[PDB]
Amino acid sequence: TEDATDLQNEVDQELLKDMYGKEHVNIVFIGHVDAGKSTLGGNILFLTGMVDKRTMEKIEREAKRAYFETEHRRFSLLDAPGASQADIGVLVISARRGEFEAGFERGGQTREHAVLARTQGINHLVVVINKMDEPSVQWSEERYKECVDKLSMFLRRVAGYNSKTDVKYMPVSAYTGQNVKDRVDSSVCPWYQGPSLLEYLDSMTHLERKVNAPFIMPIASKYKDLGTILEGKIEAGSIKKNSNVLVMPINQTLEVTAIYDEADEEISSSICGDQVRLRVRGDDSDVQTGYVLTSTKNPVHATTRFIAQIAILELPSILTTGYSCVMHIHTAVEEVSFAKLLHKLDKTNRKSKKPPMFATKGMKIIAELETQTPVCMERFEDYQYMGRFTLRDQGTTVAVGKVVKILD
């Protein structure tokens, strides 16, 4: 009834590189006159190894396509006023006395900023309470609570943000870097419990473009309860309740009726990133794990022929085409066969001028694969986990790869 590992057999040797790039995210930074935007930005580029001290200092004085990286993502900074939409919107608010307060008055532009965000499609606003080090504020839990509560009422009032479930507040010092890359030390701020800014940014689940994409949730387990329970990780989009999903590749319709979190509570909705357990009405006689629950308008793709970069780990090593094993792309489990060894690879992913007649261990290649049955997938590029597979020679492992192109 269930799936042990969602090709989490991808463990062993960190060669997961060049072929499994980091997640491309689009972040924008919003804030007042001297809120700290430029310093915050610069310090992140430096603290995160993108730039040197001089460059840092250069950038910051001249602000008066860049990008940074965390463990699992690459963030591309966008201007203030497809890859045009922000995934994340960071409002930078100064915690200094006089500056903070200035914002919420005739002169100040904070209400404008909340509306700007809203217009830009930011429904999960990240609010950074900057300058917690500045003498007028020295990491006082009271100053922090003062700012956060004013912002709570304010943002709900002028732009509808519900601070309990929409806005994430965070204290930082853009100048000293405290709570930017690394959490603030207890000796400096005994009270803060959460993560640093980049920690949150690296793990944070609500990415606008992805939340707004079509729904995709590979079925990881089918089992009974008050009826059938399809369940897995939502990989894109969002799911409501008493709303119809499509089952691919079979193209059969169904209706969600309950959503249960990892603590089995009947919620009304979840988004991408969440690990949920659904329940549905409809003929699920042909439904099985591996298949993908998706939007009825732009459903996930399914094909039988596609292209893909691969890397052999330890197979007996030989012959082009043919070779049949067991692919795993997200929970599907499917007999796949080589069908046109097109290019080889090496060191600095070049390509290949002499299409091999076969492959071997320690040889990464690209080739047209084939399945008798169609399997749901997408380009890693577009939906990483929907294009991340591992091959398996009848028991043992063999290779691992990503899909690059869908062939009709």
Ligand X SMILES: Nc1nc2c(ncn2[C@@H]2O[C@H](COP(=O)(O)OP(=O)(O)O)[C@@H](O)[C@H]2O)c(=O)[nH]1
Q: Which residues are annotated as a binding site for GTP?
A: 31-38, 130-133, 174-175
Q: Which is nearer to ligand X, 36 or 299 (CB)?
A: 36
Q: Are residues 187 and 160 in contact, defined by beta-carbon separation less than 8 angstroms?
A: no
- Which residues are annotated binding-site positions? 31-38, 130-133, 174-175
Pull the structure tokens for residue 135: 């003498």
> One-letter amino acid identity for 382?
D
Cα 351 to Cα 313, 348, 356: the distances in Å are 20, 9, 12
Residue whose pair of structure tokens reads 């690394």 in the numeric block: 182
Closest distance between ligand X and the C-beta of residue 136, in Å? 9
Q: Which residue sits closest to ligand X, CB atoms considered?
A: 38
Q: Which is nearer to ligand X, 99 or 370 (CB)?
A: 99
**Peptide bond connecting 249 to the previous residue in cis, omega within 30 degrees of 0:** yes
Closest distance between ligand X and the C-beta of residue 96, in Å? 7
Closest distance between ligand X and the C-beta of residue 195, in Å? 18
Closest distance between ligand X and the C-beta of residue 166, in Å? 23
Q: Which is nearer to ligand X, 33 or 319 (CB)?
A: 33
Q: Which is nearer to ligand X, 173 or 270 (CB)?
A: 173
Alpha-carbon distance 264 to 277, whole Å? 8
Half-sphere exposure of 401 (CA within 13 A, CB side): 29
Q: Which is nearer to ligand X, 38 or 295 (CB)?
A: 38
Q: Are residues 46 and 56 in contact, defined by beta-carbon separation less than 8 angstroms?
A: yes
Closest distance between ligand X and the C-beta of residue 137, in Å? 9
| Burial of residue 243, with CB atoms counted within 10 A of its CB: 0-12 exposed, 13-18 middle, 19 or more buried | middle
Alpha-carbon distance 20 to 309, whole Å? 10
Q: Which residues bind ligand X (CB under 6 A)?
A: 31, 33-39, 63-64, 130-131, 133-134, 173-175
Query: Which helix (H) or strand (E) segment is 43 a member of?
Result: helix 37-47
